[PDB]
Amino acid sequence: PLEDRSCTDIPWLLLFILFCIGMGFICGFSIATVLSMILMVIIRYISRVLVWILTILFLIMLVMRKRVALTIALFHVAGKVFIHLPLLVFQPFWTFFALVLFWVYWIMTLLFLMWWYHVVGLIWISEFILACQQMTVAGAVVTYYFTRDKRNLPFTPILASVNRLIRYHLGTVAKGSFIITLVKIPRMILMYIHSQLCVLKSCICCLWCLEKCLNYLNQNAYTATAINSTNFCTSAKDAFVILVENALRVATINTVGDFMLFLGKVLIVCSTGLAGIMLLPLIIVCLFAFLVAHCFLSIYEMVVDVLFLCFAIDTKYNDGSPGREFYMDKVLM
Amino acid sequence: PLEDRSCTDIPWLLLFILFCIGMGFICGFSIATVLSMILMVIIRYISRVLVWILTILFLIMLVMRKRVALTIALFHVAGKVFIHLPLLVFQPFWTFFALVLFWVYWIMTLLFLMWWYHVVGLIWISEFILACQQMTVAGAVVTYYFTRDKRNLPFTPILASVNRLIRYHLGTVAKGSFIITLVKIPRMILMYIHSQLCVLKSCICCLWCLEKCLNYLNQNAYTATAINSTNFCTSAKDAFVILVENALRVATINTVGDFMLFLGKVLIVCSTGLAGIMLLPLIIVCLFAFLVAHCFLSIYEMVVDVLFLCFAIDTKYNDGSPGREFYMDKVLM
Numbered sequence: 218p219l220e221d222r223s224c225t226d227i228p229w230l231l232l233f234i235l236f237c238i239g240m241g242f243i244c245g246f247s248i249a250t251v252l253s254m255i256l257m258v259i260i261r262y263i264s265r266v267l268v269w270i271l272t273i274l275f276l277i278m279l280v281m282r283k284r285v286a287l288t289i290a291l292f293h294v295a296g297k298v299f300i301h302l303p304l305l306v307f308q309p310f311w312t313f314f315a316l317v318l319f320w321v322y323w324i325m326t327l328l329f330l331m332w333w334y335h336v337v338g339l340i341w342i343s344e345f346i347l348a349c350q351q352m353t354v355a356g357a358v359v360t361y362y363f364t365r366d367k368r369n370l371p372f373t374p375i376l377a378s379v380n381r382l383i384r385y386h387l388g389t390v391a392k393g394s395f396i397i398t399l400v401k402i403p404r405m406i407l408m409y410i411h412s413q414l415c416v417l418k419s420c421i422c423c424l425w426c427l428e429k430c431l432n433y434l435n436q437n438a439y440t441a442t443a444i445n446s447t448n449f450c451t452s453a454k455d456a457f458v459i460l461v462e463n464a465l466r467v468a469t470i471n472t473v474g475d476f477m478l479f480l481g482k483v484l485i486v487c488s489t490g491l492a493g494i495m496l497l498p499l500i501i502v503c504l505f506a507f508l509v510a511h512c513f514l515s516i517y518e519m520v521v522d523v524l525f526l527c528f529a530i531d532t533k534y535n536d537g538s539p540g541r542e543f544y545m546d547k548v549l550m
Numbered sequence: 551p552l553e554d555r556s557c558t559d560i561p562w563l564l565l566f567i568l569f570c571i572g573m574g575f576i577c578g579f580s581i582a583t584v585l586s587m588i589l590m591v592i593i594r595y596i597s598r599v600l601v602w603i604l605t606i607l608f609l610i611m612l613v614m615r616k617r618v619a620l621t622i623a624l625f626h627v628a629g630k631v632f633i634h635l636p637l638l639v640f641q642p643f644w645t646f647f648a649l650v651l652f653w654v655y656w657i658m659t660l661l662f663l664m665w666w667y668h669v670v671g672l673i674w675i676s677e678f679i680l681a682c683q684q685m686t687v688a689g690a691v692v693t694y695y696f697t698r699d700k701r702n703l704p705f706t707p708i709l710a711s712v713n714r715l716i717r718y719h720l721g722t723v724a725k726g727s728f729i730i731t732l733v734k735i736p737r738m739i740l741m742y743i744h745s746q747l748c749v750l751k752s753c754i755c756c757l758w759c760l761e762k763c764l765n766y767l768n769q770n771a772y773t774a775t776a777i778n779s780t781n782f783c784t785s786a787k788d789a790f791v792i793l794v795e796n797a798l799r800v801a802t803i804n805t806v807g808d809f810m811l812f813l814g815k816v817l818i819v820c821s822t823g824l825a826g827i828m829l830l831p832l833i834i835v836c837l838f839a840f841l842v843a844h845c846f847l848s849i850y851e852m853v854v855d856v857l858f859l860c861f862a863i864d865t866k867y868n869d870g871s872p873g874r875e876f877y878m879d880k881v882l883m
């Protein structure tokens with residue numbers, strides 16, 4: 218159902234470009250005058266054992282056994298995704314690289330002597346770049362999900378998905394990163410005022426919670442766009458309804474996946490960091506291991522969230538019949 | 551589509567009854583040892599004029615003209631409902647009566663010398679009785695809505711709907727009044743602590759807002775149950791989706807209906823209270839007029855909320871075709 222590429226949002230692409238031009242004008246105006254990645258596959262067996270031992274020793278928890286089984290099954294499929302797409306795990310370094318290049322440009326142009334372009338620019342463009350990662354991962358994962366066999370592009374993560382983002386759907390990302398910018402900046406202003414006084418803790422924490430809610434929603438909205446190739450509002454509303462109807466499954470996947478994945482990166486970098494010391498003192502190895510383990514499991518979580526929404530859409534439409542077959546793997550629930 | 555009466559929820563009916571028995575045990579254990587109702591019809595013409603004059607003298611508001619037209623049309627139909635059901639306006643006095651009888655029992659049994667049954671009892675049972683009013687009104691209004699002609703029970707509000715609540719759906723109300731009880735009591739505890747200190751204003755106000763959100767949702771869930779005759783969770787989820795998809799219409803109906811209906815009761819009791827004084831001092835007439843005008847327009851608002859959800863369901867299903875006709879009145883939008 219993926220063979221429809223309709224660009225979906227143009228006004229917000231134009232606003233993003235026009236802003237970037239205005240920022241460039243101000244710039245020029247003042248100038249001219251030992252890895253943990255092993256977990257990406259094996260963590261699918263560790264997670265099932267972890268649950269198995271935790272529930273030994275109370276039994277009211279059994280009503281959730283159906284919801285945890287889904288969470289575990291999704292991790293198994295996520296392992297298959299990274300096996301099929303060897304380049305996917307490395308994708309965060311191109312995002313980091315791009316962020317650095319922008320940040321160096323930003324800080325260098327701030328030195329030349331309107332100012333609101335640099336304050337808004339820094340935040341909006343950085344969120345834009347990060348939101349582009351979310352669309353890019355969802356594209357590659359969706360392509361895998363809806364392929365019924367082993368035939369694909371040899372290097373799908375760099376041969377596909379990014380081409381669709383830049384050619385068609387770049388406007389959809391622009392709108393989403395703008396919406397979150399309108400929240401991230403007010404929160405920073407309140408934090409500044411608070412420290413200069415000090416009773417703003419409640420309103421600052423509320424906006425912080427809002428940021429997480431909007432981010433999660435945007436990530437699902439981007440995936441829904443990649444599948445249905447519609448505009449932002451339609452994708453966000455469709456994904457929202459699915460998240461509400463399956464809210465019990467979303468809460469389980471996010472609470473259990475977070476606990477398990479947290480132990481994943483923490484336990485493996487503790488083991489790696491203490492290995493080979495033999496009573497010799499540096500901790501630079503421990504910091505390295507933390508940073509790479511975090512970026513590897515961060516994108517791992519993204520793949521699981523995309524697979525969940527793909528499953529839900531694969532049951533809202535395309536039900537079973539002699540002429541209709543599911544795109545899902547053998548995950549029956 | 552209303553000919554299906556399936557009881558919908560039994561476990562929460564049993565829990566409600568078992569609690570009431572436990573409360574009765576504790577009781578016995580310690581013992582044995584000039585009206586404003588004219589508005590119910592004419593307010594449908596006053597509302598349209600009020601909007602007409604307010605928009606004379608800015609024009610950005612015109613984008614909402616489609617949403618206000620719906621709000622006005624719903625008020626017109628609400629007038630028809632009260633004309634067809636003359637007994638409906640008087641219904642709040644039986645709710646008040648029932649609340650008094652319980653409250654007298656409660657306070658009398660508190661005097662005999664476990665205590666948690668009286669604290670939880672007072673709140674849960676009172677919300678139960680009030681929630682029963684919400685189901686009762688929705689039943690009568692839904693019956694009118696889905697009747698295509700003038701044939702009905704002569705005294706439908708007392709001949710129907712209450713029979714369905716007591717015979718089938720009493721368990722559905724029990725669950726809803728329990729959920730709101732779990733919020734109303736913590737809020738009261740925080741208010742108590744605050745006055746004995748004083749920095750709890752934020753968390754108290756948040757719970758208060760939550761109470762209004764849950765109440766509104768429950769009222770729509772009860773109406774959805776009356777139509778679809780399903781269980782609470784299914785009705786609440788279905789009504790929730792409709793409220794989100796039409797959120798722009800809900801915000802308009804609640805913000806404009808509240809402003810107009812507020813003026814309705816306030817203006818008419820001011821006029822009645824100052825009438826016939828002729829320089830004669832009592833204000834007991836003004837208080838009487840306020841109290842009756844409030845209960846009359848409170849149930850008026852309930853009828854409008856039920857009609858809105860009925861309209862939405864009448865367009866989600868039962869679309870136009872040679873074999874399908876809408877149940878709605880001539881409200882085309």
Ligand SMILES: CC(C)CCC[C@@H](C)[C@H]1CC[C@H]2[C@@H]3CC=C4C[C@@H](O)CC[C@]4(C)[C@H]3CC[C@]12C
Pocket residue numbers: 234308309310311312315345346347349350353379382383
């Ligand atoms: C309008 C003109 C002047 C500027 C256009 C800039 C475009 C081409 C830039 C801005 C943001 C960039 C994206 C930001 C982040 C990533 C993640 C990375 O892992 C792969 C490349 C990818 C997906 C980039 C591709 C190129 C991109 C879309």
Ligand SMILES: CC(C)CCC[C@@H](C)[C@H]1CC[C@H]2[C@@H]3CC=C4C[C@@H](O)CC[C@]4(C)[C@H]3CC[C@]12C
Pocket residue numbers: 567641642644645648678679680682683686712715716
């Ligand atoms: C279990 C046994 C002993 C007691 C059962 C008591 C039941 C029948 C009582 C308790 C609360 C009552 C409801 C409380 C309030 C109202 C509002 C009124 O406008 C119509 C009747 C209605 C909807 C009542 C119907 C009867 C009711 C459901």
Ligand SMILES: C[N+](C)(C)CCO
Pocket residue numbers: 429433471472474475
């Ligand atoms: C970070 N999670 C995705 C696990 C939860 C967001 O609410």
Ligand SMILES: C[N+](C)(C)CCO
Pocket residue numbers: 762766804805807808
């Ligand atoms: C009281 N209203 C129904 C008007 C609004 C509730 O949020």
